[model samples]
Target: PAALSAPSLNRGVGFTHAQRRRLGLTGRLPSAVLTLDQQAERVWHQLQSLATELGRNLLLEQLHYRHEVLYFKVLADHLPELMPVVYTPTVGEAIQRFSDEYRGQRGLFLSIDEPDEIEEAFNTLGLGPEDVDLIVCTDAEAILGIGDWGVGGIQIAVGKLALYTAGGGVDPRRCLAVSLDVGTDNEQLLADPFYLGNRHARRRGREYDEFVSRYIETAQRLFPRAILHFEDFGPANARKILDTYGTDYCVFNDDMQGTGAVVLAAVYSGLKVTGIPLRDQTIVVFGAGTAGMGIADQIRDAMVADGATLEQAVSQIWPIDRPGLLFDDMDDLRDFQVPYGLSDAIKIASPTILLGCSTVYGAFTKEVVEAMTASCKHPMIFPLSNPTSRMEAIPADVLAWSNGRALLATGSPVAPVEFDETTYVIGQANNVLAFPGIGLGVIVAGARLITRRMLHAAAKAIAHQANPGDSLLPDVQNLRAISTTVAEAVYRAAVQDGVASRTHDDVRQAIVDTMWLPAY
Candidate 1:
């Protein structure tokens, strides 16, 4: 009887006295009928008692399983404190132990081993095309700063969707998370007896691409209303996949475009701090990977939007890879890198802004920081790498090297830096601040495409949220408000581009009306 009358679905002590009798839940839960607010207060204090992030993450997961509403309400109520646990660096650790910490099966895990069965697997989600609004899918090849994770990468898809609900108010019931297990190249995973994937070397070339195509095709057919978000695919496939499907479907690649948009917003805030114009800043990107090229691409677009010719805009930004500065003479350059290439490194000329997406530890040394500081009154230095261990430079070192004059932000969150007896809070260029709102805008407007113009609007919206200060970006405490600002910008752009399938007389009110709330 208890098994049939699931306590998790019962709402426990939060149930109303009359509704408990009507639903036959009488005596199944404690007699105390607390409001969702009171329950959330109790849960928050319990979460604070945990000493470790992983421990708190575990507790939150357990709570989510038992009471979905209470779990989300708690997360929404305490976003600043709980976000790191629910996603990012903490999620990366949970993914590593996915098999070991196996609770119940979550999300749809479709492997290349059964290509024909993929459609049937999707059908099992039991949502009609109109019922689903968003899908976050990953192949797990390039997860965070960590390499190939096999099935463990599913957590990224799951975690990203959580942000959609918490930060952007996208309905949780209308979304899906998926992991396409094509197998993994990680030998450690294959050697593990408990590993739950294809158990072969990663499929590559035409076969792999074909498998990806099939998945997209099936997803498009099954969830016609859903916006596809591709995450953590390897560098080789990420841009290629996005390029192929971007024009044809409502899709986005977070690693490429999302990273680019957030960095652009930080740059906008940095411009205000430095008293420099966007057109005047000389930019150098330290890594020419998916993220690096994406940043360069967005900056070039913004410069052109400000009246520079495409060629002139391209000239302002320089890209550097392992072989050093990219140039026309270099034959090994990827197609996307060619536009931002130069024969010499921008460092020699002392660029005003230096961004590190290289994931190379200690890449921006004292000499590099000193060079930028020497050239500009207030140099913009962003060591934007992940996992903390892979950062190009730490905040303390950057502040000390630049004599506390560098306008700084990092990819990973860091504590306030104490320099010259002044404590400065470091802004984080986390994708969470941009992507959730961007996606929410598309979903609400029923936009056929998410364009470059829309992304720039989102960036500008975020940049304006900051007050004039060393804090170049808004903190997570104002996440929901920031998300609303970005969503409005993106939705307005969709209308201007004439790609929105639906329109409203009051677009702002439509966004507010559509936002999902945690209340029952």
Candidate 2:
């Protein structure tokens, strides 16, 4: 809504002539401007001039902070290059230095000290629930390798929303960014008087859950079609919240589910190139928390899709958590870790696929890689951790330990691996590949429900991106088109499933309009 002093006006979210005139934006933006391509080219020049990654990211962030439309145009032009800056590796570092690099504010913030005025605070932002299509909310508890940074974690919300607009083709105006400041446990934060958070030990029990429930219910009632994204919450709270609201609201923990989908797509593509059936492989996951379980479920889905029974699909996995290799007889394990239990039965035969989602870097010791090498003709190893420091298995170690027979991927990007005169591009199995496209499809199709089948469609779309027996994965450059393709597929599936809001005739056009096509 415009200011009350403005003259009478009527229009949608876009700037209207009469409203612009009233607001004095008439000559501010040119009536006839360059297309998105021209805008990207101009921005790309400025982007390339930056000397450091941090400087480059600050420039990108400033671009998004002000001319959001132009920023999105540049991002949609070169998704593969910009994704790292917008979301991960770079985002983790950027968030760590947010206060210093701060150019402009981008999200809503609430203070527990003023909890009584929470409602008024939300209203003051000029964004009611009805106007927002997506919300990236965070408590700043566990962000990447960095420990709890409290309110400063708002950078994650900003980064995630930027990706949604650029890579997913979601409209920037329709997205909301939020940071839930519940206080911080970081000692550095507590010691620093300049820290911008509640500066208390983390809240727990019913009090925390109560505030979260209030947020969800209020946001949902305000925006029935909007989806809530949870970021950087601690493992315990993250697990609890998703289990509580998954079916009740359109809430998703991207660290768990989104990571799973992207890794699944990479493995699916790897299998296609290697000519190995999913059901034929034995797998070992190094971590048993949110990310590992998510990957296990996706693998189980892949196996079931390729004609394996549910029982057989789940039976092939061996999960190794902090205690050691998981087993059905474990006396101590979280319920989330207990399901895909493994016993000493795994060490007897070894595994074709080995993944490490645990935060413990270098945990995939020489023995583990060797076991993987001995197990199959070409062992697939995905050390899926971030920040490079926490990555358990590097390409050099995996390749050397496996005697050059390992197929590799990781959560963070790695350089190309060379062994025995063959160069293998170690794919970065990051969520940047899946969620952006999935979100676009959901919005365009007006899907009422997101389903496993839609994710399977995305997996299939990504797997078919390259020709038979080429690189184990699709070239990163093709991700924009792949995202567009995945969006269309999910949209179609949503309509067929009878849960779509789109009329039959509008589905195609909706997806077409929502896609972020490069002007080039």
Candidate 3:
């Protein structure tokens, strides 16, 4: 009863007179009972009054810990405004100061030292196997370009699951966030007195691999029905880990496949606006990292799906890295960049599409944009780097440089650009657009694997949602609807591929039914 009456569970100011009397709470709350709407309004004003995004984020965090219903309600109501505050740039700051700012128990933390106690840590989560639908796990190695942060990376899992709930309608109560605490290699974090993880250098080789495998085994045993999401792992391990387990379990790596799918959706939408077929476009991908390779792979698959031979499809794409274009003769060619290694004095001119995954700022200069515009009638440009500071080129500059002929999308959100009395809204190429629906589809269909076909179906569905002569991607506000559309497409693909363990006569209705809503 005392646990039931705690502030976290108790609905402050919204409880009725009758309920208050029944629970013997006559003097517990103010006499004037207000509706949830009124309470939300009061909080909204306070949130707006905050000076910094971090302050607003803290307020929301406190609200989430105390009143679950109102917190989600406020978040759902002001999603577009608060998403950046709670998830990305602000959450990056939160992760940086996690040890200083943590308020209460938010998720599970499993250490490499205590490998035998993995199940016990999971048991402390207080969830049964059937209760969990999703799990977002991270090791603090490569967190949002900030490098290793030890246990501080737990906030990445927490923020990602928040998107799963807000964007895909996954039940907040049925999801988990986890951090795999190996030692930190970051010198600053190791030196800090308040660091919450092991002080030794990071573990590698056989022991680290064994720990990861054991965690996965324990998680799968504990929550058999859940979809596992890998987040913010370093480049060396991200693809390797995903490739190892992707075939055997319902797993996703947001940095790789999720970024790829969303970028592909934007490309599809841009192609529709330009009236260009998928198979006949010249493409230059400016970065050959995990994300760049993933985008190239998805686009190559789509072209092959459209009847181009794999060789022909691969021929159209040129992957460029810090040392100019990737070539076969280069001594340091990674396996992923081998197929698209176009050998030539690579120039950016005359390409139908130019993608900047190169994290270096100002990489796509006015000269580059103008060169593309000088040759092509409509050039598609996507500068997909994170944090506003590191973007290759801003939307305004791209539009001005191309004279409004560039079909543009960016990684970070940009305001509408005005030129020649025409307002062009820049589409944000955020992975949230693709990953949530992908997870939802896997969860609803009980799929044993998340396949390339399912991911392609999701990209096609999202592309269909975008209209010609508008933004190259759907707005974030319509993500719930778009997620359903993507989910339906993915479920059908899973069913056809024979990977779905559960069948529904009406898959569309089933997807809608599976979605959870936050309410009293």
Candidate 4:
């Protein structure tokens, strides 16, 4: 084997002396051998020396390409501290500056220019259908809240797979990160001399659809059993493409379903904390785009499952977009948007739950929150817009406005609020809590398709993990345990839906058995 290949596979300093001897003479390596834990200590020290999060991210990326075992081990050890570095806000920065300091391949990139040879591109990885359990593919059009970063979106694919391995017990080797490199409409990227993506305008309409079709078909042919998880695409194509491939294959839209599941989990947990029956809650989802619609649809589905009729479920939800409120008679309303319309204003409706996915900053004002809590004793308020700047309202303000009666969740991480001497922990309604478990569940169950029941089960499992007085959702650090619970729940749902192909008597134990450890 080549020397380069050995570093990626070997445990580096953690390799036992006997292992070194078996491979070759021990003289080629350093005499001192360290334990895996020792190696982690050394790596953590090295990471702390880095000045900035971006620098730390780069160091971690380098470590990942060189030694995946150490990479995942570090992540598993310090997931909560490092998640923002690798995924959301920090990953957003990485995508922006990706072309400036281009690293070697972290994932496969399929360009619109080279659509014909997608199989060859994938075949280069030397992975078979059995080897792949999950694929996080993205077009980078709507990454987090940042708009199109073009090929730099590959960074998200890489980052997501890391979470899949870290938060859930997914074998990192079984996952593939993919970037579908359609052209960019961003003027700055096009003008940049170092830009690695296509210089042409964004490909859309027929050509773009066909490009997606080719990739999907190739993915199915190559990795038939793999769960295809679609990451951030533009709002226009995100749900559209998922609608195309969702029911047929094991396809998932993270922005849509993952967000919906995680928020629903928080909602369910909040319901328990508030001692409210599920049927009695009146919900309003602000910003009726992909993320908001996902929240609305998921909550509606939960209501239907709880024995409420479709009309009853639909009647309870209020989805507000740019138009005042979606009514049946509005000419501007999309077909799907017509059903869950509430004519009453927020003050009049006395809604128990208010969720924000709209990027409009500070939309959930003092007046709006006060109105909700005027009638309901403990209202659940979630301002789930990404980045600190674009959030609907700060958690401290919501808690203050509600006189510390609001159970708050934010799209971005927030510090605990101290209002009237009571410290209220703000739950982060992040998709990271949902998607990894969702992936692990579908993979272990060998489910034919990911269903609404499975997603609902995931939400309920996570909700149960949260305590009444603490965060509305489980603490981020307990995600590995939470994911295990979620996976077990989703597996049971799969069995009920008749989509599960595997038969495991003890599903929790089965899921635990499948988790990977990176120790030497």
Number of the predicted model whose TM-score against the real structure is largest: 4
Tens-place lDDT per residue, model 4, 69-188, is 777667777745435687764554667765776654556777887778888878887787677788878888878766788888877777877788777777766777888888888889
- Candidate 3 regions with alpha-carbon error over 4 angstroms: 5-9, 79-82, 89-92, 101-106, 337-350, 507-520
What would the per-residue lDDT of candidate 2 be over residues 1-520, giving only the tens digit for each residue?
Answer: 3343221121112354555677755555456455457667777887877675667777766555555555666676664454467666454467666644443244687755445655666566567555567677888777865678778777877777766666676765667777888888888778877765677888885677778887777777766767677776676777677677766566656776677677777777667656888777777766677556766777676677777887666667777766667666677666753244233434664677767777786766787666556656777777777767677767876777777777777767667776656666757666667777777777665554566677777766776665352254566666666777777677667766576655555446444435243332
lDDT of 4 at 361: 72
From the highest TM-score down, the ranking of the candidates is 4, 3, 1, 2
Query: In candidate 1, which residue ranges exceed 4 Å CA deviation?
Result: 3-10, 79-83, 88-92, 100-106, 321-323, 334-348, 507-520
Which candidate number has the best lDDT?
A: 4
lDDT of 3 by residue, 53-123 (tens): 57777776677667766765666675454357766654456766556666436577778888998788788
Could you tell me the C-alpha RMSD of candidate 2 in Å?
5.0
Q: What TM-score fits each model?
A: 0.92, 0.83, 0.92, 0.93
lDDT for model 1: 0.75
- Model 1 earns a TM-score of 0.92
Cα misplacement distance, residue 245 of candidate 4 (Å): 1.8
Alpha carbon lDDT at 231, candidate 3? 82
* Count of steric clashes across candidates, in order: 0, 2, 0, 0
Query: lDDT for each of the candidates?
Result: 0.75, 0.66, 0.75, 0.76
